[PDB]
Design a protein around this ligand. Structure first.
Ligand SMILES: NCCCc1cc2c(-c3cccc(O)c3)c[nH]c(=O)c2c2cc(-c3cn[nH]c3)ccc12
Length: 269
């Protein structure tokens, strides 16, 4: 129709190791472009095409163009949740709770369509212009439920400080409790500004201390009673005993009023 509308200028590197910010030549609309020097990606695309939720990074499409693939996704101008966490401090409890509510909404959605993310951590949780959290990076994601039949997972996948202990100790495991566990580690990080262990193994002193309930120690001592009681229910070694999302939604801290709305209208007299 209108000429030039399909043209995008790549104006800035968002992340690399690449993701570029693309701006439409005509409309100035912004999108994030992931550029892969194809020489998993097909899985990330196939999974993204299935996704449509306010707390999940929107997928717009892809272009093959030889061997270099282009993935067009929602631009999230607030950046990574990771950058909102102050080292050794965390963030205000009300903000952590709101981000945690949004994270649970995104995860409930994914699990509802039979998808597990498998790599939930603050680097993969993006923020839009209004600080709305959006789960990103579906490169390690997989279908754990198909035709109403659950498939148990067995592949080692994720990021050590965030992985559930059963992934290190058992040959097979249910997908859902693994994502619940990593959300508990993200919550800990938001409230203490530190990760509690390098990995959840008995050989790891910090992990043993947690299982012994030594909450007078570091990251736990910085966390208030209410959210700490929720963490005691999420970071449970046995995944069959671990709290499920429907029960997280019933938790006292989860439902505690703490945070005011965005705030915008203000004039007196
Ligand atoms: N783990 C983060 C990696 C880097 C990364 C990926 C993405 C993807 C995106 C695109 C394709 C695949 C994918 O996994 C994520 C989609 N949308 C983004 O906005 C975005 C992004 C935005 C910022 C930023 C810094 N200031 N303001 C925004 C920084 C790093 C980013």
């Amino acid at each position: 129709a209108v000429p030039f509308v399909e043209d995008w200028d790549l104006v800035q590197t968002l992340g690399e190791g690449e993701v570029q910010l693309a701006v439409n030549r005509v409309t100035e609309e912004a999108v994030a472009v992931k550029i892969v020097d194809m020489k998993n990606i097909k899985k990330e695309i196939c999974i993204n095409k299935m996704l449509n939720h306010e707390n999940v990074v929107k997928f717009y499409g892809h272009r093959r163009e030889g061997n270099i693939q282009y993935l067009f996704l929602e631009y999230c101008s607030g950046g990574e949740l990771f950058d909102r966490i102050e080292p050794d401090i965390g963030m205000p409890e009300p903000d952590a709770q709101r981000f945690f509510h949004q994270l649970m909404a995104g995860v409930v959605y994914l699990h509802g369509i039979g998808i597990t993310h498998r790599d939930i951590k603050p680097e993969n949780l993006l923020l839009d212009e209004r600080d709305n959290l959006k789960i990103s990076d579906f490169g390690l994601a997989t279908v754990f439920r198909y035709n109403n039949r659950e498939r148990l997972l067995n592949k080692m996948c994720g990021t050590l400080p965030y992985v559930a202990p059963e992934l290190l100790k058992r040959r097979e495991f249910h997908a859902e409790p693994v994502d619940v566990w990593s959300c508990g580690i993200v919550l800990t990080a938001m409230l203490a500004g530190e990760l509690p262990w390098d990995q959840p193994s008995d050989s790891c002193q910090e992990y043993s201390d947690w299982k012994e309930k030594k909450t007078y120690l570091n990251p736990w001592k910085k966390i208030d009673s209410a959210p700490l009681a929720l963490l005691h229910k999420i970071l449970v070694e046995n995944p069959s005993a671990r709290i499920t999302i429907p029960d997280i939604k019933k938790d006292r801290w989860y439902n505690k009023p703490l945070k005011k709305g965005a705030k915008r209208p203000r004039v007196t007299s």
